Amino acid sequence: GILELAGTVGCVGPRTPIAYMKYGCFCGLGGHGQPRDAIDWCCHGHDCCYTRAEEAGCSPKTERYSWQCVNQSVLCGPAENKCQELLCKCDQEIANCLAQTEYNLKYLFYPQFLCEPDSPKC
Ligand SMILES: NC(=O)c1cc2ccc(OC(F)(F)F)cc2n1-c1cccc(CCC(=O)O)c1
Numbered sequence: 001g002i003l004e005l006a007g008t009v010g011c012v013g014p015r016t017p018i019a020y021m022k023y024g025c026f027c028g029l030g031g032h033g034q035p036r037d038a039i040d041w042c043c044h045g046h047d048c049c050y051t052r053a054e055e056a057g058c059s060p061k062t063e064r065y066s067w068q069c070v071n072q073s074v075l076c077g078p079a080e081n082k083c084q085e086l087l088c089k090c091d092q093e094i095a096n097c098l099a100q101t102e103y104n105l106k107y108l109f110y111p112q113f114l115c116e117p118d119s120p121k122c
């Protein structure tokens with residue numbers, strides 16, 4: 001869920017998970033357009049992962065799961081079902097992705113009107 005998303009992102013990376021609440025075209029609720037930068041690509045990937053999770057019959061925004069932060073790395077589990085596994089994998093992946101990026105302050109609170117209606121495929 002959102003709680004774990006914030007936690008996992010905070011665990012791995014160097015910045016507040018708040019830094020991704022409204023960034024570029026994809027970091028934040030929904031998203032469309034051409035990704036602005038590396039961070040935005042990570043969020044596009046993550047949106048795709050959550051879509052796949054929803055298609056698999058999971059609730060990515062709400063479902064709780066267990067995980068651990070060890071040496072600024074996410075370890076997933078124990079998992080009670082496939083949805084918990086899938087969601088942790090999505091969040092672990094975005095956390096890892098974002099940790100390897102440089103932050104571009106200019107894309108924080110980027111205007112949605114600059115984001116094109118069409119997006120790269122998942
Ligand atoms: N892939 C993303 O957009 C995304 C990346 C990210 C990173 C940290 C984060 O931490 C926070 F919650 F503290 F900001 C939140 C993050 N989001 C996010 C924000 C709102 C909704 C959704 C659901 C997915 C969606 O509808 O697009 C994801």
Ligand SMILES: [Ca+2]
Nearest residue numbers: 026028030031
């Ligand atoms: Ca998004």
